């Protein structure tokens, strides 16, 4: 064995040994339990960053831990290759997005292989390849036939100067990012997933996820935004029907989640697009200007929660169906057309938004809810005004004295008796718009025929291949200007027709890639039935909480869609979630590596430290160890050159330790079996050993805290250094300690542990398996305790080292000599000195 640690030499050698053994190249082996450990596949931007390193080391630690415990572990890797960053690099360097993407994949793959991740590279996928996206095109056409995917006009942001559609992330102050021209709102036909049909399923199935973080489930619930409220109809007064047609001439319909406060309504508010707003503003210019300012605004919830709530009266009146009061209709900028009825009631006494709105305009505030002892001040807002669990109704006539739910049910029955309302469930969730006016994305498998309409491409003709020899320029998608692409024949009539030129939301590819990993070479479906039945669902998912909402929601939606199609039989894709904290680095006034002598490392400010320089300078094991040791996985990690130095010296210490042990007599059989007769020092070392094994096993398997597991192995080595292991039984225990230490650290730093193991033991490491805990090594020695009766030694008892004072009291009173000297009398007191004596008085 060589004396000094050389990661540049041993890490390539250890990587080829694993590759030649094909331990990571797994199949649907029914003779072993499966474990699917998935890390979020990266966008092939060009180079890895320490964020990738931390994420994929965490996944590799869990994967290698399960492999050592005898699991058939699948840890697949892939490339989220579609999206804008390639389209922006295409216009910068004048290259095709495909060639720019494949150059990055090939390079980033070599960077990943040099880190030693136990990856099944035979299951690699690239989402921009037709062999992949043909199956999301297939699912598109199948759901299109069922109406789950439909075509409908939607609003987009049009740039009149750049001649392109812009996302809201590129529209600032009503203007284009790289143009600055006033952005128009255009209605164009687009495609949507009817995800609202699955809202109740997407909400309730969260209860099945017993191992998800509670805040992630909370974020999913708030995004869906289910509310159980009441539809309420206010009859339009006789004097307020001018110019109103249809149902809008008779009643104003609103939606409310507080029908228990309907007796407290003092006014109602409609959206600027509501027919009551249009009819009232017909001869009032002040209302026409208000409606225009509302339309010329942002429905962005961010801007809406920060905007000044404004309103103007209309002079039109509606009638409350419970108490008969005539209420004036206001046009308000916070009422949104398209959400519910486009109109709401207002209860300023029990809704904070309505209180401030009515405080500005001096509208009445009628209390209809009391919370026991609290006092109601119409000029102040307390937090209990909107209390829904402890409130009780007042000023409600029939409903006085009821709680929220009882008043809810009673108002429901009263409104249905008069035909003026009914219970209604609503969701803030809107349908999922698929269409993107971009080139570098999955083509939409629709053919437009002037005789047949929007026609789906038959399954025999899939995929619709995206042409790769394209250099986008940013002034409109090139597909709309390529007649050789969109000119086609209608698959229903055969006449001249046009292909859809929009591409798909890149969230589509990440919504089902975890299933494609199960059979990435399958050509008869999204995923083969056999591999789907074997792998089931993802056992462990590792990625940012930034994706806790849309990505997870879309992935869960696609899982149920594919299940309903009979492709899979699981309800949820991910059983467990691990969210790693971001990696941060000091900024300088550019990469710190190009600098000589603190925010998230991202492409935005180019703070990302290139892992390849750390690998060349210290090796992959030093990189992996520093990531897992600096902080818990969920906690943020700060880049520290001092941190990578301490990690490398520990690996030098681990190497030096095994070398010095083998220099002093070579390898022997590891100690095992009965440890009676071992010296006290060697028993304590074995106790520390199997205590460390239990602690590392618990930190990998349950807590998923890797920094503490490394610290535990460090403590075991510290006690090893202070232990004389020169004797024959001493050498046997030293062999047992080192054989476990290198296996406990193998998931973190597999390169050095693989090399050290084969110098210690001739068997394959992954066949010796995860170290077991010898429970006998955890039992400490027994102690003899003196028994006293009124201070006189009456006998002795043999006590356990873990015995409580109650155990010594129980054992001291059972002593024969005690009972004989106690003369059948009780003890007014029983003093207990643990580990010395117990005296009964
Ligand atoms: N189109 C709309 N624009 C603005 N506000 C609306 C609109 N439709 C309903 N509202 C108001 O929003 C209130 C709450 O509805 P939402 O769907 O947000 O439920 P919620 O916030 O979960 O309910 P809660 O206020 O009881 O916690 C309703 O009581 C109603 O007054
Ligand atoms: N600085 C970082 N520290 C730790 N993990 C990171 C960091 N940056 C990205 N990751 C993780 O790397 C994985 C791949 O992320 P990816 O390259 O797709 O970017 P992203 O998370 O989508 O970024 P953005 O939100 O800016 O679009 C994810 O699990 C993500 O959480
Ligand atoms: Mg269960
Ligand atoms: Zn046709």
From Swiss-Prot:
One GO process term, biological-process aspect: leucyl-tRNA aminoacylation
GO annotations of cellular component type: cytosol
EC number of this enzyme: 6.1.1.4
MF terms (GO), sorted A to Z: aminoacyl-tRNA deacylase activity; ATP binding; leucine-tRNA ligase activity
Catalytic activity reported: tRNA(Leu) + L-leucine + ATP = L-leucyl-tRNA(Leu) + AMP + diphosphate
Motif, 'HIGH' region: chain positions: 42-52
Main localization category: cytoplasm
Localisation per UniProt entry: Cytoplasm
NCBIfam families according to UniProt: leuS_bact
Family assignment from sequence similarity: Belongs to the class-I aminoacyl-tRNA synthetase family.
Protein name listed in UniProt: Leucine--tRNA ligase
Species the sequence originates in: Neisseria gonorrhoeae (strain NCCP11945)
């Amino acid at each position: 064995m060589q004396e000094h640690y050389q990661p540049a030499a041993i890490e390539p050698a250890a990587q080829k040994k694993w590759d030649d053994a094909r331990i990571s190249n797994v199949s649907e082996d029914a003779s072993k339990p499966k474990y699917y450990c998935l890390s979020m596949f990266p966008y092939p931007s060009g180079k890895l960053h320490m964020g990738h390193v931390r994420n994929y080391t965490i996944g590799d630690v869990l994967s290698r831990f399960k492999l050592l415990n005898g699991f058939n572990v699948m840890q697949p890797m892939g490339w989220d290759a579609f999206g804008m960053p390639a389209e922006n690099a295409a216009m910068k360097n004048n290259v095709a997005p495909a060639a720019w993407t494949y150059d990055n994949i090939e390079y980033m793959k070599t960077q990943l292989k040099s880190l030693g991740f136990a990856v099944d590279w035979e299951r690699e996928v690239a989402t921009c390849k037709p062999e992949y996206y043909r199956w999301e095109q297939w699912l598109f056409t199948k759901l299109f036939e069922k109406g789950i995917v439909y075509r409908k006009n939607g609003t987009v942001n049009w740039d009149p100067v750049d001649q392109t559609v812009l996302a809201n992330e590129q529209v600032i102050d009503g203007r284009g990012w790289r143009s600055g021209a006033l952005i128009e709102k255009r209605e164009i036909p687009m495609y949507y997933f009817k995800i609202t049909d699955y809202a109740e399923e997407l909400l309730n199935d969260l209860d099945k996820l017993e191992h998800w973080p509670e805040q992630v489930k909370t974020m999913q619930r708030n995004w869906i935004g289910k509310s159980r409220g009441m539809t309420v109809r206010f009859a339009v007064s006789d004097d307020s029907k001018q110019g109103l047609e249809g149902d809008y001439a008779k009643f104003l319909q609103v939606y409310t989640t507080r029908p228990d406060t309907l007796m407290g309504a003092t006014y109602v508010a409609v959206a600027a697009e509501h027919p009551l707003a249009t009819a009232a503003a017909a001869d009032k210019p002040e209302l026409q200007a208000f409606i225009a300012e509302c339309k010329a605004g942002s429905v962005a919830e961010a801007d809406m929660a920060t905007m000044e709530k404004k309103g103007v009266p209309t002079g039109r009146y509606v009638v409350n169906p419970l108490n008969g009061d005539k209420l004036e209709v206001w046009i308000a900028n916070y009422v949104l057309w398209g959400y519910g009825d486009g109109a709401v009631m207002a209860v300023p006494a029990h809704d904070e938004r309505d209180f401030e709105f009515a405080a500005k305009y001096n509208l009445p505030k009628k209390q209809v809810i009391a919370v026991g002892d609290n006092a109601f001040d119409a000029n102040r807002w307390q937090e209990w005004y909107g209390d829904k669990e402890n409130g009780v109704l007042v000023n409600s006539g029939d409903l006085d004295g009821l709680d929220f739910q009882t008043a809810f049910d009673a108002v429901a029955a009263k409104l249905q008796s008069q035909g003026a309302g009914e219970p209604k469930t609503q969701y803030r969730l809107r349908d999922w718009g698929i269409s993107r006016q971009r080139y570098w994305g999955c083509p939409i498998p629709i053919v437009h025929c002037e005789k047949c309409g929007n026609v789906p491409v038959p399954a025999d003709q899939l995929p619709v291949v995206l042409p790769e020899n394209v250099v986008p320029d940013g002034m409109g998608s090139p597909l709309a200007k390529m007649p050789e692409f969109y000119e086609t024949s209608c698959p229903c009539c055969g006449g001249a027709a046009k292909r859809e030129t929009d591409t798909m939301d890149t969230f589509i590819e990440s919504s089902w890639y975890f299933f494609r990993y199960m059979s990435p070479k399958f050509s008869d479906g999204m995923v083969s039935a056999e591999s789907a039945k074997y792998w089931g669902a993802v056992d462990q998912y590792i990625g940012g909480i930034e994706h806790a909402i849309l990505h997870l929601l879309y992935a869960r939606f696609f899982t149920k869609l594919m299940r309903d199609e009979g492709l899979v039989n699981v309800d949820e894709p991910f059983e467990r979630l691990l969210t790693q904290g971001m990696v941060v680095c000091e900024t300088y006034y550019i990469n710190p590596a190009d600098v000589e002598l603190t925010e998230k490392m991202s492409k935005s400010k180019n703070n990302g430290v290139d892992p390849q320089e750390l690998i060349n300078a210290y090796g992959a094991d030093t990189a992996r160890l520093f990531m897992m040791f600096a902080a818990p996985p969920e906690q943020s990690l700060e880049w520290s050159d001092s941190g990578v130095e301490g990690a490398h010296r520990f690996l030098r210490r681990l190497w030096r330790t095994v070398y010095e042990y083998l220099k002093q007599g070579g390898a022997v059989k590891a100690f095992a079996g009965n440890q009676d007769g071992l010296s006290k020092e060697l028993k304590d070392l074995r106790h520390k050993l199997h205590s460390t094994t239990a602690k590392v096993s618990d930190d990998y398997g349950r807590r998923q805290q890797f920094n503490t597991a490394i610290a535990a192995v460090m403590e075991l080595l510290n006690q090893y250094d202070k232990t004389d292991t020169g004797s024959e039984q001493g050498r046997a225990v030293a062999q047992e300690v080192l054989e476990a230490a290198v296996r406990l650290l193998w998931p973190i730093v597999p390169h050095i542990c693989e090399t050290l193991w084969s110098e210690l033991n001739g068997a394959k490491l992954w066949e010796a398996g995860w170290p077991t805990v010898d429970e006998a090594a955890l039992v400490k020695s027994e102690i003899e305790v003196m028994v006293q009766v009124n201070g006189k030694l009456r006998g002795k008892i043999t006590v356990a080292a873990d015995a409580s004072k109650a155990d010594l009291e129980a054992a001291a009173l059972a002593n024969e000599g005690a009972v004989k000297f106690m003369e059948g009398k009780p003890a007014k007191k029983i003093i207990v000195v643990p580990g010395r004596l117990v005296n009964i008085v």
